[model samples]
Target: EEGKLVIWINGDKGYNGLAEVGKKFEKDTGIKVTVEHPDKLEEKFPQVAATGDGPDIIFWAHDRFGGYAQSGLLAEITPDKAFQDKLYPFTWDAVRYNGKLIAYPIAVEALSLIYNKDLLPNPPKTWEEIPALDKELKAKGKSALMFNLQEPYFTWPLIAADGGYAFKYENGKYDIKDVGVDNAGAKAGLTFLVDLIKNKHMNADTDYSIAEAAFNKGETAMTINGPWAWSNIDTSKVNYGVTVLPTFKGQPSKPFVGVLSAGINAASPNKELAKEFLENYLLTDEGLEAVNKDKPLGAVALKSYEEELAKDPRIAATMENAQKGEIMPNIPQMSAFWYAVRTAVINAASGRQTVDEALKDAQTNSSSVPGRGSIEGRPEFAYNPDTGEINWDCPCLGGMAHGPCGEEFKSAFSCFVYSEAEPKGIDCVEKFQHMQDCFRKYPEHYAEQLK
Candidate 1:
């Protein structure tokens, strides 16, 4: 209580609440508090952790907690058993890695299917019904669905409902050995997106601004999005409602729950002070009230917050649909899965490969990731000497083309003529083979190329 406690935060709302609470705490407990806000959080977190000379506490998303816990950069709080029951089970489960709890949860967020009442009197319970409903709306010249493809987080719920999962955990460790990218569920999920595209049911060009404009102008009937959009969604013209994403084959779509929390830095000289600050300024009633007043961020405490969140018709319906929702894995290896999955999704969407084939390739690329399998002697490709062409097939083309000579090719090509102006096939195949071989040999180095 005698020393200054330094706190780091990502968003302005939480920071403002902490600052106001810190002043009050100083008057009551005679402790000095300093708060720091950092831009470029992805870079700042590692730099602070590496140097062991940063703020005493910080606010961050629980989806990122797994890496910090695994790396020994976060303090294990399992021994502090007093705070366990007070937290939400789902929230607590997110920060736990290898039997250690590393952070305190603040809020929970899940994706919901938001719809315009004027467009559809009743919402579909399963995604399989979405296509038909979309068609019906389109016949009436109304837009069916709208979403942004820039982020995978937005679409992962659909994949989850189809029973696709990014990573599997077993025996107290994570296993990427048999990821479910090409599983039946994943194919079903991809088909949903394909049907949307095929039927012109949804618009893929809906960026943040465009989506807001469309929803506000009553141009779109439905969309799948998170709670953060509640403020941006226009409720003036249409009687809009929210529900959980539809199910697939009787199984509900599972969304990734994003938990926002406050983490205490392990290197802080004021560990006890930081803990006290969090308890008083974040976990307590006064602090929560201050934070919730401005943003109306559902509940601050687990039980009361969930109850209050459920009372809202839109949120209640959304939560009912989200009973099967999943917490996004906070694992470090998640980065690999994202890059691989994004490539596969794009390939499928752009008609480069059938959904099944793209997912299979994604699974193959993501499995046996670093620290999971030996990196030596991975398979490589070669050109066929007889035809002066590559024997390899483009995974993006779903085995249709030898090497990269497929419609998926995104670059210009030039053919080299053989003897006496007779044109020989361009060596695109050989060039593609070499590139694929390089990719296999250095998966990490070449990952960005695929993206």
Candidate 2:
């Protein structure tokens, strides 16, 4: 009974509550669920889930869920109207990849305004009120507001406030070809953040530690932050207030929101039961309530539950803030957007380059990421020739990407897909040897790429 089914989750309170929840599932349905904290989940999941030997479900962030679905490592689930109607409308966009509901979204998170009550008595109603708050604080010789200005994750709302987005969305898909970093609205948003730094409204502090330490120490009156920041901010040391992010152009500036989701492995032996459990148990009010009691970092996706949980001012504001939020695109192309967008924003604000020139370069840089058809970093092979054991590291992307074979098992090939010397739960050398031998028998499949 203990060995029936397993679900993979992180080593956190979030996963702890789920292990407890599994007990209930077993008592009622006679289906045992053992929750495990898998190591290197991002990489190990793809390799193991390819066979029918992996877990039945995976609970993690929706942002990383796309790569699994794209790799054919996760199952595609179609939520019915009753299922889809429960969560916030916007939450659907985050879990939808390639026109399929690949995961069950549990909680939503986005950056909202956090004000130190001792400095700012009332939260600003709009963006115009924000500048004055900054001025008033400076008049007192303290920072009005502080955030990781160089990190695009925290600054995405600014760019998005003026209709700027990283990629084009059309026909229920993200068209990576249409980049927006240098768009006029994006330029305006970037320019606005630069103006704040140039005018000394906020310091162009490079690292997140500087801003968090400053805000928690009561040096700053306010900060544009998210629920995760609550962990770092010692409530005992800082008297703070939470509210919907300030509005601009008479509308709230939407931040990029992420979803905490549950997904089924494509090769799961209990796919049917996994789907039922996701629909009937995990996404239910009772289940969310149990998890939220242990982990209150964000609001659950169900509107009824969110309203009930909104008694806490932070949860109330977070739920409302999510309504105006744009789901951070989960597409793999977004990997570049994170680093490139920040560089442009930071460089322009620091007077390293004119806003126009710097942002144009950022647009080109962000859009240069590999699209669905590319094979770069897709093909990598490392073999311990002495043992005749090779780790198969081919991605779904078609192309030849080979590395220099090693002489012995101890040799270094970390630059390849993975290193053999560094051992894990299962060594790749023996795991995929059969696959390697299958292709070796047929030279036609090997000749074009091997040479």
Candidate 3:
């Protein structure tokens, strides 16, 4: 009897489709297969690979796995001549790292400018035209555009349109020693963004969820997002249209394209068998169709599936934009690049700093920040004596509070007292001080509340 094959999948796209594929693989191959989904593969995989206990196969975004390939944690997947010819250039380009292919492309996720046709009778074709259209809309008391200012994936298109790029390739490696954050092209795009938000032509607080909601509610004229959002948008309320992102200075906007793929772990004992299973089960004509059914906007390797994708108007629109898309670098340092860019853009939008200051600060700070979610060992909460409070300075919640000792504590206390117990009047300073003292004296009590 043979041992069961184990495959660990990272959480990216929902697992419903992948689960079905796994079931079909086991049934058809007559091999015992188990699928394990892990939330933090970046941290987990390295640990597993160190112990030689990693799964046989993994599914992840191409950009996230480049570092692993460089470290020899991933197997080089040079598709046979026959299989290589069937793939799209864009799809193949994503999985190739340092002259070695590390993964098999599954789907290409594309983005474009989605506009409300009723509100925006005609969408602008160029970035310069957007400002003028925005002014006209403002006069009529309407929104011109909305997008997540804190995500480079949403903002890089504008930079690309203005001929700015994050890094240039030199001998299969990105030479990011001279970053283009403060370059003329990058600044032009950022200046346009700042003007749009400052002039109230677009909402300053528009995130992905908010932008989608605003678009669906017919509030915002347009937003830049991927096809994954199509399910959430209420298309019946307004006539919506999809098109390539506006051009800047005659250059078309190029979005950061995300490609998801399946890769075999180099540490796996059954690497060859896993690759065979992936090729036969996941990359087959029927498997491509199954995966494409879940991702209508993605580009698959099979020409038959490609034709099917072309038939859908929405999918076709995304495909057109993908042709001019920029594949994000899969290098380890890529994480620092994206996070720094996002922080700089949001800081510029909030008037916390000028574009020049933000970019300069980001460039200087990027080296010290490590990779995404990398902290110098996760620091647990410690009560601060001077601040007289639990030093709860998590960026996620702190930014929403407006200022230190802001309304967050007040709101929580008010709700707690109103819903359950009547407490004596607790001033902001006193409450924070008392909470800090309590946390210091009795860690268990504080832990209970936190839980």
Candidate 4:
């Protein structure tokens, strides 16, 4: 570990490619580069990095960059003016936190309307055209549009089509204080989504997997998804076309634009070496192409690759969609947006409340939860005085923390409870994994405890 730089990535999504980059890095610098694809890197990295035990570098979605940077888990990366100028403007917003450059953005992506071209030769361009298509498809026991519900990521575009926004963004920063999910525009958008199911245009309980299955089976004419879903279409041999999300009530639907990026760990001893690796090799055009080869990470951040990547229809459509969309707020307060919005969607969909009531509750809930870095004290799990039961329903506990590995559980769970990161107690996943491993070691005892 002394003469080597360790890098962690989530999966094989970039393993072979990164390994190739590592090999090239070794040949050039005489410093070995090792790439590790670890499970739950998002959860584990924060806990290990605090103790200076994490990898020298990490590649992950930019959404986590804000929390890591605010918590000092990532090193400040000043890529210089030249490098910054080469990337798309929005990519910069994904990597910066509190005026500090914290990560190197790689690729950008957003949702598009992916349709089965064979089923509907020309996809509906407006809301008025959809009802007719839905009626025609219903006669054949099929549907016109089938997408993932119960997920805000996929449905947010619909909610935003009529002008709903998660947070008010102005003067180059998001106002966490300005909650907008309950606005009339959001109610109008949510109403459209509920009507889709109520009108039997789509199944009431379809989730991502179910939607994917139906689409792949060629039973649905259209779906809203990102470039990542291309493999499913290609593998299934379904003729597909990627296009901008259709308009609703004259307003174009806008999805959240996200970036995938790599960051240097601030706690790594080989910080300078890691920085060298990125600047000299991994963040270069050659490196991006290599990593993006097999999987093809949507629209790359580098302007040099723009025209070449645009040749692919999926990338072209996603690039267009990204242009029309708003960058997903990278702040940790976004955690509340995910929670509150999903609750509102599900509440309205399940008939638990009217759309207005659901969004009203969402706005209240979003405002009540503290933004990232707002907590000042350790949160405690509930304790019953009479029954002596530990109610592990808090964010810190992750909902379950009892077993033979009680001590290990406490060790890990406590880290999350005391962490200053808002959406409190996030980024301690490795400790939980270690606790699970401990339970495996003492299965008989853990089984008894489960009772």
Candidate 5:
């Protein structure tokens, strides 16, 4: 019913898939649909959206759902049973917040085992076989397996196989306070990685660039990568096939499934039109086909599209992995888990800390602390009324303290200190916005501030 519908999507894949649908949508309804691809969409979304200038719709991952929906940036959606039945049940869990569906899930992705058919001929079925395979490959001057080592995303399977999880889900809700990243299972998983690195089965410093390059060069036989690798990698160099990753310690290693979804903007004037476009056009067969056309997004969440998506064997493997994978915890508190776990994994992998020590520290670092009943201390930026002078020389001002934006800094800093919320400064978004504007206008005088 609206004249125009604007969508903001990240990356070329999103544009490649949605742009065609936009054209078809406009042709059918006479409502112009603009599919905009922008750089750093995640970073820019909240900032722009808070100003009431955001797009009608946004296409991104479900992991971002918790942050946006909780921040009042996303509109809650309830798809009909017919539409709900069309998609896989697991995909829905990733997009829901407190029993409310915040987005329309489009596609699913997770990590899987991609092997060189020419070198290995057969893929190992479990982690125990890695040492033996490495020995065999070493004689041939090749590595058995390599993946992004320090990355929490790639290494999570090791941790998850034992029972490590980011948060506890119960009674249709996630308990943010119950963190499991450093539990017994997590320690076992971290130990597996450290053992592999120490034994030379996998390199300590191996990352996406090094591991993927080594596999492409035929120096590595197998690697753990996602479905995107199928489209991005050089197919001519290595005869590769995809499969579910090997089990760790007799348990299947479950990777985190990042569901890509389309969500309506809460600030949009065209909310009804946006919902209509998403429900009527974007979720249809033709719309999904365009998305999966250029680069197969691993698995199609739509059940009817399974036959079409499975035509490619790589996609089939990814679909299997997605079925077995865990939904990435869609909570803002997950941010803490990701940062802490990665640091723990890096320290353990690099021999800087013991596995137990790293995991313990990570657990302690990531745990949530309840906010105090009241903050009694004087605010960081305050006027010395007794001396009839401004006392803004606090260290909390950081680089901005000595810069030209003292007024802006003081306002933002005061908001942060006296904020009653567990995470301070959330209530002072406008004050922070003003400070950021000043920082951007005069970037030369600003130095890095200790947070």
Candidate 6:
């Protein structure tokens, strides 16, 4: 009866493979492990874990490692030096925080340049070489590479290849105080991107759909994306090949290396069993093979499996590009960079800001914004990042009623709120303060839901 364990992962199909692993773990070690793919891994964990009423382990993107680590919500993991040698350095390096191993990486994702092999016989290796290719490309009535320019994640590699970075890596840790997103080289990269789109006949209006459609129709000679783009491009429609992204100026394109990983909760009552399940089984060939079968997270975390994993037609291309890229800083500071830098990238590309002005403004704003974990301490309500705001499950979606706006409702915001005194109660003012901007910018659904 004492041998019980739990893990929380995404609702994706990948969890089925993970669940099987749990089944095996129970048979071997006499530990009954339960794996659940909840819809709100981010929301439920923080609140429940505070009272030690949550899973022993959780799988998440490396980006969240920083926030969870800072809040002392996750246990640190130290891999054996010999064991570390068997994993990808980029992935191993990414899953650490403050020189501590906070999680075990399961996959790596980085964008590469995909081109129509027949149309672009020789994919350019540098941005300087792209102009000539573009000329020849347009002569054949095809455009050059085009991606969603407004997406900061897509544009960041272009900036990084030109020497921009969210934070400087120093002494095996990220120096968040030293942000490089606005440095001279980064600025030049952003400007190069802006001007490239303007003069090379690439469209800033060319969003993901537009870019994918153009790429599939053979209107563009090249594209920038991850393995996820393969299914979107009908290869029968265009003979395509993927390679590492072209450099900006003389610098190599350093796309962000994103890692998806698993970690144990610090409050887990079954710490030893959690470690045994994750550290031993999850890192083995049997475990990774199972995960790869259901849904390949990306490049596998272990070096031993990558060669075999390379057999996957699309994964090989991803590994090549991921190999050439820079590790995305997996820290809380990165959350700040997304919104502000996104604005700057769009503004500069749309002829709204001079290169220096846009970059500098983005750097300033990005540095100032606080991580959401800091906004609400030990929160109960979920933060729906996809919706870009939080929502309550009750009466008065109307900007949080001041004093119970309805007889149906006890009070504003939600009848269900978590407080310092009340672990399950809402604070309207607190909710509004952090999410006011999201509410102001997007209230169609919010307005329609009001009583």
lDDT (C-alpha, whole model) for all candidates = 0.63, 0.69, 0.66, 0.76, 0.76, 0.70
TM-score of each: 0.70, 0.67, 0.70, 0.76, 0.75, 0.65
lDDT of 2 by residue, 1-451 (tens): 2246788876433566776678878889888888888765645666677754677888776877887887787888878898788998767778888778889888888778998886778878877666777776664558777888767777778777777888887887778888888888778777877887877787777456777777888788888777757755655467787898877666568787778788888877778888767778877888876666555548778877877667888877886787787777778656556656767888887889888987887776666421111212333234443665545443332322342211211121232234332222112322233333443555564442252
Q: What TM-score, to 2 decimals, does candidate 6 have?
A: 0.65
| Local accuracy of candidate 1 as per-residue lDDT tens digits, 88-113 | 78778777776667888877766688
Worst 10 residues of 6 by lDDT: 406-415
Residue 179 displacement in candidate 3 (angstroms): 2.5
Instruction: Report residue 4 deviation for candidate 3 (angstroms).
Output: 5.4
Q: lDDT tens string, model 6, 1-451?
A: 2458888887643777888898899898878878888865755776787865777888877876787788789988867888888788878777878778998888777777887888778888788777677776675657788788866878888788766888788987777767787888888888777777778567777787787777888778888877556654554457787777887877788887778788888987777787678768988889877866666666878888788767866787677777677777777666556656877888888887888888877776555332232124333343443553544432223334222322222222222332332112222333333443443444563342242
Worst 10 residues of 4 by lDDT: 370-379
Candidate 5: where are CA atoms >4 Å away?
1-6, 10-14, 29-44, 51-55, 78-82, 139-141, 200-209, 233-237, 307-316, 372-451
- What is the Cα-based lDDT of residue 55 in candidate 5? 81
Alpha-carbon error at 6 in model 5, in Å? 4.8
| Candidate 2, superposed: residue stretches over 4 Å from native | 1-56, 60-64, 78-93, 126-135, 138-141, 171-173, 198-213, 228-239, 248-251, 267-277, 309-316, 330-332, 346-354, 368-451
Q: Pick the candidate with the highest TM-score.
A: 4
Of the candidates numbered 2 and 4, which has the greater lDDT value?
4
lDDT of 6: 0.70
Superposition error at 161 for model 4 (Å): 0.9
In the predicted model 5, the residue pairs found to clash are none
lDDT tens readout by residue for model 3, 115-134: 77878878788777777776
Error of 5 at 97 (Å): 1.5
Candidate 6 residue pairs that clash: 417-424, 417-425, 417-426, 418-425
Better of 3 and 6 by lDDT: 6
